Design a protein around this motif. Sequence first.
Motif, PDB file in Angstrom:
ATOM      1  N   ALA B  16       0.845  -1.108   0.151  1.00 10.14           N
ATOM      2  CA  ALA B  16       0.026   0.116   0.106  1.00 10.14           C
ATOM      3  C   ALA B  16       0.967   1.096  -0.051  1.00 10.14           C
ATOM      4  CB  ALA B  16      -1.057   0.043   1.233  1.00 10.14           C
ATOM      5  N   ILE B  17       1.874   1.164  -0.590  1.00 14.13           N
ATOM      6  CA  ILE B  17       3.115   2.333  -0.645  1.00 14.13           C
ATOM      7  C   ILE B  17       3.670   2.085  -1.911  1.00 14.13           C
ATOM      8  CG2 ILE B  17       4.736   0.932   0.611  1.00 14.13           C
ATOM      9  CD1 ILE B  17       5.835   3.540   1.640  1.00 14.13           C
ATOM     10  N   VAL B  18       4.773   1.698  -2.120  1.00 17.37           N
ATOM     11  CA  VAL B  18       5.646   1.305  -3.206  1.00 17.37           C
ATOM     12  C   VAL B  18       6.731   0.196  -3.304  1.00 17.37           C
ATOM     13  CG1 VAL B  18       5.768   3.948  -3.682  1.00 17.37           C
ATOM     14  CG2 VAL B  18       7.448   2.551  -1.858  1.00 17.37           C
ATOM     15  N   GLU B  19       7.485   0.322  -3.554  1.00 14.34           N
ATOM     16  CA  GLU B  19       8.715  -0.838  -3.712  1.00 14.34           C
ATOM     17  C   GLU B  19       9.525  -0.914  -2.453  1.00 14.34           C
ATOM     18  OE1 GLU B  19       7.107  -2.851  -5.029  1.00 14.34           O
ATOM     19  OE2 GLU B  19       7.364  -2.398  -7.176  1.00 14.34           O
ATOM     20  N   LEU B  20       8.835  -1.013  -1.285  1.00 11.51           N
ATOM     21  CA  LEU B  20       9.592  -0.706  -0.036  1.00 11.51           C
ATOM     22  C   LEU B  20       8.514  -0.586   0.878  1.00 11.51           C
ATOM     23  CD1 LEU B  20      12.140  -0.496   1.489  1.00 11.51           C
ATOM     24  CD2 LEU B  20      11.977   1.814   1.289  1.00 11.51           C
ATOM     25  N   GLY B  21       7.505  -1.296   0.572  1.00 13.75           N
ATOM     26  CA  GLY B  21       6.137  -1.149   1.254  1.00 13.75           C
ATOM     27  C   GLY B  21       6.317  -2.460   2.361  1.00 13.75           C
ATOM     28  N   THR B  22       6.857  -3.643   2.006  1.00 15.08           N
ATOM     29  CA  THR B  22       7.061  -4.652   3.112  1.00 15.08           C
ATOM     30  C   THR B  22       7.938  -4.097   4.112  1.00 15.08           C
ATOM     31  OG1 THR B  22       8.080  -6.829   3.116  1.00 15.08           O
ATOM     32  CG2 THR B  22       8.889  -5.495   1.635  1.00 15.08           C
ATOM     33  N   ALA B  23       8.713  -2.906   3.597  1.00 18.19           N
ATOM     34  CA  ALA B  23       9.392  -2.012   4.587  1.00 18.19           C
ATOM     35  C   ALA B  23      10.420  -3.057   5.165  1.00 18.19           C
ATOM     36  CB  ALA B  23       8.726  -1.285   5.530  1.00 18.19           C
ATOM     37  N   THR B  24      11.139  -2.441   6.165  1.00 18.86           N
ATOM     38  CA  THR B  24      12.128  -2.856   7.373  1.00 18.86           C
ATOM     39  C   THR B  24      12.801  -4.087   6.372  1.00 18.86           C
ATOM     40  OG1 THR B  24      10.437  -4.280   8.401  1.00 18.86           O
ATOM     41  CG2 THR B  24      11.136  -2.410   9.247  1.00 18.86           C
ATOM     42  N   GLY B  25      12.990  -5.293   7.201  1.00 20.08           N
ATOM     43  CA  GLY B  25      13.391  -6.509   6.659  1.00 20.08           C
ATOM     44  C   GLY B  25      14.659  -6.231   5.528  1.00 20.08           C
ATOM     45  N   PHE B  26      15.060  -7.313   5.010  1.00 20.59           N
ATOM     46  CA  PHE B  26      16.039  -6.805   4.135  1.00 20.59           C
ATOM     47  C   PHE B  26      16.162  -8.139   3.156  1.00 20.59           C
ATOM     48  CE2 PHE B  26      17.820  -9.276   7.959  1.00 20.59           C
ATOM     49  CZ  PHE B  26      18.109 -10.383   7.256  1.00 20.59           C
ATOM     50  N   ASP B  27      16.588  -7.767   1.916  1.00 14.58           N
ATOM     51  CA  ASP B  27      16.696  -8.824   0.712  1.00 14.58           C
ATOM     52  C   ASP B  27      18.243  -8.903   0.443  1.00 14.58           C
ATOM     53  OD1 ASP B  27      15.037  -8.818  -2.249  1.00 14.58           O
ATOM     54  OD2 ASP B  27      15.840 -10.289  -1.103  1.00 14.58           O
ATOM     55  N   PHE B  28      18.654  -9.916   1.168  1.00 13.06           N
ATOM     56  CA  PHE B  28      20.262 -10.485   1.132  1.00 13.06           C
ATOM     57  C   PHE B  28      20.362 -11.562   0.101  1.00 13.06           C
ATOM     58  CE2 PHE B  28      23.415 -13.325   2.355  1.00 13.06           C
ATOM     59  CZ  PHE B  28      24.720 -12.448   2.631  1.00 13.06           C
ATOM     60  N   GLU B  29      21.483 -11.677  -0.458  1.00  9.33           N
ATOM     61  CA  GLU B  29      21.869 -12.678  -1.577  1.00  9.33           C
ATOM     62  C   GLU B  29      23.094 -13.256  -1.497  1.00  9.33           C
ATOM     63  OE1 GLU B  29      19.754 -14.345  -4.755  1.00  9.33           O
ATOM     64  OE2 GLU B  29      19.087 -12.139  -4.309  1.00  9.33           O
ATOM     65  N   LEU B  30      23.106 -14.676  -1.620  1.00 11.72           N
ATOM     66  CA  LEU B  30      24.400 -15.373  -1.235  1.00 11.72           C
ATOM     67  C   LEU B  30      24.649 -15.848  -2.757  1.00 11.72           C
ATOM     68  CD1 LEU B  30      25.906 -16.533   1.140  1.00 11.72           C
ATOM     69  CD2 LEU B  30      24.535 -18.319   0.818  1.00 11.72           C
ATOM     70  N   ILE B  31      26.137 -15.403  -2.906  1.00 11.53           N
ATOM     71  CA  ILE B  31      26.753 -15.724  -4.307  1.00 11.53           C
ATOM     72  C   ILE B  31      27.617 -16.630  -4.162  1.00 11.53           C
ATOM     73  CG2 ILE B  31      27.702 -14.609  -6.496  1.00 11.53           C
ATOM     74  CD1 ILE B  31      24.946 -13.296  -5.740  1.00 11.53           C
ATOM     75  N   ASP B  32      27.751 -17.511  -5.475  1.00  9.83           N
ATOM     76  CA  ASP B  32      28.861 -18.478  -5.514  1.00  9.83           C
ATOM     77  C   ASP B  32      29.805 -17.799  -6.678  1.00  9.83           C
ATOM     78  OD1 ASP B  32      30.439 -20.434  -6.422  1.00  9.83           O
ATOM     79  OD2 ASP B  32      28.924 -21.773  -7.595  1.00  9.83           O
ATOM     80  N   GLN B  33      30.847 -17.375  -5.927  1.00  8.94           N
ATOM     81  CA  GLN B  33      31.963 -16.637  -6.585  1.00  8.94           C
ATOM     82  C   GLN B  33      32.935 -17.324  -7.501  1.00  8.94           C
ATOM     83  OE1 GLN B  33      30.498 -12.468  -5.368  1.00  8.94           O
ATOM     84  NE2 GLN B  33      31.217 -14.409  -4.258  1.00  8.94           N
ATOM     85  N   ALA B  34      33.007 -18.745  -7.256  1.00  8.83           N
ATOM     86  CA  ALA B  34      33.849 -19.656  -7.796  1.00  8.83           C
ATOM     87  C   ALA B  34      33.109 -20.631  -8.413  1.00  8.83           C
ATOM     88  CB  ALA B  34      34.869 -20.262  -6.656  1.00  8.83           C
ATOM     89  N   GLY B  35      33.468 -21.593  -9.201  1.00  5.07           N
ATOM     90  CA  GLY B  35      32.523 -22.707  -9.493  1.00  5.07           C
ATOM     91  C   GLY B  35      32.139 -23.731  -8.380  1.00  5.07           C
ATOM     92  N   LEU B  36      31.856 -23.168  -7.278  1.00  5.43           N
ATOM     93  CA  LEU B  36      31.403 -24.267  -6.281  1.00  5.43           C
ATOM     94  C   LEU B  36      30.451 -25.304  -6.653  1.00  5.43           C
ATOM     95  CD1 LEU B  36      31.252 -21.827  -3.248  1.00  5.43           C
ATOM     96  CD2 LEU B  36      33.005 -23.235  -3.960  1.00  5.43           C
ATOM     97  N   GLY B  37      29.458 -24.614  -6.951  1.00  5.04           N
ATOM     98  CA  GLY B  37      28.221 -25.598  -7.581  1.00  5.04           C
ATOM     99  C   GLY B  37      27.004 -25.476  -6.588  1.00  5.04           C
ATOM    100  N   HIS B  38      25.740 -26.280  -6.832  1.00  5.80           N
ATOM    101  CA  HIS B  38      24.743 -25.973  -6.094  1.00  5.80           C
ATOM    102  C   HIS B  38      24.798 -26.530  -4.988  1.00  5.80           C
ATOM    103  CE1 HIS B  38      20.497 -26.011  -5.079  1.00  5.80           C
ATOM    104  NE2 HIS B  38      20.493 -27.425  -4.864  1.00  5.80           N
ATOM    105  N   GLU B  39      25.397 -27.829  -4.605  1.00  5.57           N
ATOM    106  CA  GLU B  39      25.471 -28.688  -3.669  1.00  5.57           C
ATOM    107  C   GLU B  39      26.054 -27.809  -2.358  1.00  5.57           C
ATOM    108  OE1 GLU B  39      25.808 -29.858  -6.428  1.00  5.57           O
ATOM    109  OE2 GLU B  39      23.938 -30.642  -6.293  1.00  5.57           O
ATOM    110  N   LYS B  40      27.492 -27.324  -2.853  1.00 11.47           N
ATOM    111  CA  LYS B  40      28.026 -26.373  -1.879  1.00 11.47           C
ATOM    112  C   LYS B  40      27.472 -25.089  -1.504  1.00 11.47           C
ATOM    113  CE  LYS B  40      32.661 -28.343  -2.704  1.00 11.47           C
ATOM    114  NZ  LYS B  40      34.103 -28.531  -3.799  1.00 11.47           N
ATOM    115  N   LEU B  41      26.909 -24.311  -2.531  1.00  6.75           N
ATOM    116  CA  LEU B  41      26.070 -23.214  -2.239  1.00  6.75           C
ATOM    117  C   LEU B  41      25.046 -23.610  -1.034  1.00  6.75           C
ATOM    118  CD1 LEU B  41      24.432 -20.679  -4.395  1.00  6.75           C
ATOM    119  CD2 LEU B  41      25.606 -20.529  -2.386  1.00  6.75           C
ATOM    120  N   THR B  42      24.285 -24.704  -1.276  1.00  5.72           N
ATOM    121  CA  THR B  42      23.214 -24.896  -0.332  1.00  5.72           C
ATOM    122  C   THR B  42      24.220 -25.171   1.061  1.00  5.72           C
ATOM    123  OG1 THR B  42      22.192 -26.206  -2.082  1.00  5.72           O
ATOM    124  CG2 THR B  42      21.446 -26.578   0.019  1.00  5.72           C
TER     125      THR B  42
END
Lengths: 50, 50
Positions: B16-42
Amino acid sequence: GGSYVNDFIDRGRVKKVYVMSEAKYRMLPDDIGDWYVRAADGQMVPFSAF
Amino acid sequence: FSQIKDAMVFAFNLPAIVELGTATGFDFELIDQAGLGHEKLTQARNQLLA
């Protein structure tokens, strides 16, 4: 001249697959005759022959 | 709905506002910067969540 066949994965990234002759067999004109093609009958025929 | 077995059911009022309505919280992202793989990323994800 080389040939891009399809793709394969390398440590997670899509990459290309190339098929080409090892250098020594594609350096000189006469080397063209060293390549053989299979004939319908089943015997190998050299470029020199066509 | 917290009742319902083996399932996540949430009712929420639109941001009921904009693209920051769910407010607070945080959208974090975990990256695989080497060819680790899904298993290891998990596993890295679990370790972080722990």
